[PDB]
Symmetry: C3
Subunit: 31 residues, 3 copies
């Protein structure tokens, strides 16, 4: 099967990690 | 029931709020 | 029909584009 809901939950987790990386970057670069 | 699609729609809304916070931060800190 | 999973996959794609815009902004503004 294609399990698009499971794939989407995974895509959600990848985007959370990208936003967390940007939050950290801002902190680390002291903006 | 577990309603994973509803949970995922909610998770989507939390990530939109996190990205909006970063967009605002950039504006507010004048980068 | 309402196809909430398809709508959510689309919402996912809009949020990826917003995060990519912020990643690019940081690069372009040289933070």
């Amino acid at each position: 099967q294609q399990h698009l809901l499971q794939l989407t939950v995974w895509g959600l987790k990848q985007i959370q990690a990208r936003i967390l990386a940007v939050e950290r970057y801002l902190k680390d670069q002291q903006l």
